[PDB]
Amino acid sequence: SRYLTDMTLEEMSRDWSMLIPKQKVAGPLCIRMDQAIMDKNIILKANFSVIFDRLETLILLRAFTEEGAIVGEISPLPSLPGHTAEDVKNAVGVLIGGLEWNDNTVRVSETLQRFA
Amino acid sequence: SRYLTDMTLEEMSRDWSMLIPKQKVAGPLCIRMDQAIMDKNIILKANFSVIFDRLETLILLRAFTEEGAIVGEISPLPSLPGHTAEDVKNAVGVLIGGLEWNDNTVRVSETLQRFA
């Protein structure tokens, strides 16, 4: 019983577009990032469901340019196979990877690093 | 002039082609990899110049499918700025990253891991 956020409802409800789309499936999680993006300073805001006072399941992470532009996202698979912080942190390191590839400078919301 | 190798002259002298080309510049080093490649088992063979009995400079690393197919390569920049094992290991972790992205299963020549 709960849920936690870095992002605004807006930030999440919003829909977005990749010029150079890149999907992937990391076990129970779908990573996406626009490869067209370069030399920008990015951040990963994310929002986990919180159960009995602990970061449980990640609901949604997305990547933001300084300009509030969405450039990447990790969203649970529709079949919602139960996923672990591993599947996550893994998936994360990855998206970062893919992003860093374009000289992009990627930070992470305090929320996240916490985990674990 | 002394020097060490995993690859055959053939393997190195050879020229190759990327369906989905991906370049990058990692300080003094140019990484390349064909993003088109997927679900294959890859290995990184590399060849360092050896000075007074230590792995000094990397001359060339390339990535190989099981089928002896070249799919990625790290080659020093033409201007040959003196590079360090860092610039390297960095660059390496990267290429691996980029490769792993396509479900590719990437190994590394014993030579390499050695370093450092």
Author numbering:
A (entry chain E), B (entry chain B): 87 to 202
Question: What text comes from the article?
Answer:
Present models of the tertiary and quaternary structures of NS1 indicate that the protein possesses two globular domains, each capable of forming independent homodimeric interactions. Our bioinformatic analyses indicate that the N-terminal RBD forms a very stable homodimer, while the predominant and ubiquitous helix-helix contacts between C-terminal EDs bear many similarities with weak transient interfaces.
A key aspect of our functional model is the instability and flexibility of the NS1 ED helix-helix dimer, which seems weak and transient in vitro, but may be slightly more stable in the context of the full-length protein, or become more permanent in the presence of certain binding partners.
